[PDB]
Design a protein around this ligand. Structure first.
Ligand code: SAM
Length: 216
């Protein structure tokens, strides 16, 4: 019953995407896939910091504002230029609305990490468990959703729906405290550096994408 949305006769495939233009350095064919996604990345700070931490992972920021994504593109081109032969070659940005069906972008289980760093607290579609189900679809079993905000109400709203969904399980404080991504995530971004200035609080919460029960 509760997992019907995830045991599918006709699972979808992504639309055609020339990832080689975003990560030409892995053009043999394409050598890797995007495995880390920064949803609503803003000016790209998180990606910049994750880049060296995860030199083997391709990292993609998705940003709905074209002004910001046009800017971020010039920024990572600068970072590549001013840099060894692999520097910042594993990050790029994409103009897109993450609420418009992520399975158009990524294969099933493609991603190991999804970051929602200081999301703004329903034009294209209403926010629902269905959205979280689309996130679960593109997220590997064992993958993690990383969540941080200064807005207690947004924090509690995200937590409420993530724990309601049957494919997400909250990770402990201990897990968070020993995780390098939580550390980076806390102050990698302009909005995060803002909040500490305002003496604000940083509400973190992380979830594992549970394995889907087997159907056969
Ligand atoms: C509050 S800002 C946080 C920016 C950055 N993540 C940080 O921590 O500094 C949220 C960003 O997500 C973008 N955004 C809002 N809704 C989005 C959506 N539906 N899809 C993709 N990006 C979105 C906004 O343009 C904004 O830049």
């Amino acid at each position: 019953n509760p997992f019907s949305d995830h045991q599918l006769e006709y699972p979808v495939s992504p639309q055609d995407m020339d990832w080689s233009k975003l990560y030409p350095y892995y053009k043999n064919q394409m050598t890797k896939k995007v495995t880390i996604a920064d949803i609503g990345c803003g000016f790209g700070g998180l990606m910049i910091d994750l880049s060296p931490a995860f030199p083997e992972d391709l990292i993609l920021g998705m940003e709905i504002r074209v002004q910001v994504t046009n800017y971020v593109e010039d920024r990572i081109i600068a970072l590549r230029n001013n840099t060894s032969k692999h520097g910042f070659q594993n990050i790029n940005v994409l103009r897109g609305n993450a609420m418009k069906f992520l399975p158009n972008f990524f294969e099933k289980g493609q991603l190991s990490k999804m970051f929602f760093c200081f999301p703004d607290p329903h034009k294209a579609r209403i926010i629902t468990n269905t959205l979280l189900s689309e996130y679960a679809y593109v997220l590997k079993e064992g993958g993690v959703v990383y969540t941080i905000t200064d807005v207690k109400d947004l924090h509690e709203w995200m937590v409420k729906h993530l724990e309601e969904h049957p494919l997400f399980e909250r990770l402990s404080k201990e897990w968070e405290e020993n995780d390098e991504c939580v550390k980076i995530m806390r102050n990698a971004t302009e909005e995060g550096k803002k909040v500490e200035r305002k003496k604000g609080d940083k509400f973190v919460a992380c979830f594992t994408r549970l394995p889907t029960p087997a159907i056969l």
